[model samples]
Target: MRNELEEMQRRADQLADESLESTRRMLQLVEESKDAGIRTLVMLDEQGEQLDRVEEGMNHINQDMKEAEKNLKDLGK
Candidate 1:
């Protein structure tokens, strides 16, 4: 009976250690996931700002083209 009790205690200790290690690994994964999400959000924000600038540049180009067309018509007349 004593030997059986000792064996059970040893198994319990091993299980406890494994549980602690698993919890630690899970926490690390959560932290890494959070960092990745933040990085993605930053990248998305930068892309949005870049798109806005591109749109503004295109608007200027379009206006210039219209003005050139008008000038050409006047010259032809």
Candidate 2:
């Protein structure tokens, strides 16, 4: 991704309803991670041992998701 954060905001401000629409899909992705391995599944599950990389990776993801989730919440504005 690029660092043009404000650029993206204004782009959506102009109502790229197309972009707005995909943010809805992002909601799906966000919560699908709800039961995700934030805490990680037991290491016996294999994927348990595997995805903790994401557990840390997702640490940053949480904040990023916040910035993003709020965008579409204000998308119509």
Candidate 3:
């Protein structure tokens, strides 16, 4: 009876170790994917900042044109 119990304990322990290793591999893969996703987000953020600059530049250009039109009005009016 004792030998049977010893063998049963060893088998269960080995199975547990194998299962835990699989879980570790899965968690590691998830971490890698998460890191890659964050990198994608970082690039998106840089692109977003670029868009902001474009909008600001457009606004200034429009205002400059507005002033030019007003200057022309003073001479015409």
**Which predicted model would earn the best TM-score?**
1
Q: What TM-score against the true fold does each predicted structure earn?
A: 0.78, 0.30, 0.59
Off by over 4 Å in 2: 1-52
Better of 1 and 2 by lDDT: 1
Tens-digit lDDT track for model 3 on 1-77? Answer: 68758889989999999999999999999999999999999999999999999999999999999999988989875
Cα error of candidate 3 at position 17, Å: 5.1
Residues 1-77, candidate 2: write the lDDT tens digits. Answer: 56559678877777877777789889988878865755456535777667877788888999899999999799986
What residue pairs clash in candidate 3, if any at all? none
The candidate, 1 or 3, that scores higher on TM-score is 1
What is the Å distance of residue 55 in model 1 from its true position? 0.8
Per-residue error at 71 for model 2, in Å? 1.3
lDDT of 3: 0.95
